[model samples]
Target: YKKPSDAELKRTLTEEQYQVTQNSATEYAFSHEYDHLFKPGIYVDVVSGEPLFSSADKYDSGSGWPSFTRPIDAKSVTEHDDFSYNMRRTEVRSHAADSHLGHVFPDGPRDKGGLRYSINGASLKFIPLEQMDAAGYGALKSKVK
Candidate 1:
């Protein structure tokens, strides 16, 4: 993909994505189609199209959003304070894409691990198992088990 300019980024992204990716807003859980991906796969950011998370690493947190415990690469994600919606909490995003995925809450299933990377449905494109070997996701395909 080509580099997105300020105008192009705004144009390519929907209003919600613009809010999350550019404005650092969070799209609520169950608000988009991505919440339905119950099987194994990865979610890429909408704007920069970077690999954000894998379903294999996700768990059923029952928070309505796709939740994970960790990252394939810890450095891939960055966390910051979110106090906009009258709530103070930690928000996570792709450092490269700057797209908001969700919040990193400390409350989660301890047996499985500790953190929950709650992700926004609109900020991602769920890639199913059948498409994991496809040509487009060269980086992801190489890292698969």
Candidate 2:
């Protein structure tokens, strides 16, 4: 992973982005930009610009966060065991940037893989469908609905 240095991250990312990607902080529930957004797009890593989640796999998880049934590619994201806050959870991170994306749980629509990738909006950059091809994500365009 080509992660940026701490100094570089501080200078390039906004306060909220830095907090979520660098410090593993969670944004306030129901206040994220993508929680209720259902536009056809791909969510990229805010720092590395690597495509992480696709709107095609997104669902209204009602968890006040941008939740996905799966990532655009399995190799694009990594999962780790998180035991902080006196709880056990699976923390998800972008592979290329190693940025903290969010958490994944088993409680998701069984028909769609039975996993919910609850991500932080501050950690992603939404690429609308029209811009996918130009952004080198043309392969994923057909998947966007």
Candidate 3:
């Protein structure tokens, strides 16, 4: 896996996107455009273009964020212990780019595996369902709606 340099990311991303993914900054809740979007698609790392979550795993947790039950590929992501907020949490990042995506919590639908992966939309680029196959994600299309 290759990680882009900070200079490359700064040049390629918008200010907000750069901050969220590189600086590990958090966007305000409910403010992101993807917070309420439930369309069929896949969320990919904005930097490395690595696929992260599938629409099928996304659900409304009322937490005002794009929440997913699980990642499309576990190997594509990584979790770290985060305590910057004076609270213990799991900070999730893209394995390839090492971009800060968001956090994962244990409070999710028990029936679908109780884990909530609250991700930042700024750190993602959504690929519509129809283009999954053409986008080199054809193998994962069957996992979504």
Off by over 4 Å in 1: 1-3, 82-88, 142-145
For candidate 3, the clash count comes to: 0
Taking the tens digit of each residue's C-alpha lDDT, what string does model 3 give over 1-145?
Answer: 6788899888999999999999989999999999988999889999988999999999999998899999987898999997876999999999989999999999999998999999998999999989988889888788776
Cα lDDT tens digits for candidate 2, 77-136: 999998988999999999999999999999999999999999998999999999998888
Give one digit per residue, the lDDT tens place, for model 1 in 1-145.
2346768878888888777767767677677676666676677778766777777677777888778878667777888997977988998888786666778988877875778888877777777656866827756754443
Candidate 1, residue 140: the lDDT equals 72
- Which pairs of residues clash in candidate 2, taking residues 3 or more apart in a chain or in different chains? none
What's the lDDT for candidate 1? 0.74
Q: Which stretches of candidate 2 lie over 4 Å from their true place?
A: none
Which candidate, 1 or 3, has the higher lDDT? Answer: 3
lDDT at 121, model 2 = 89
Worst 10 residues of 2 by lDDT: 136-145
The pairs that clash in candidate 1 are none
Better of 1 and 3 by TM-score: 3
lDDT of 2: 0.92
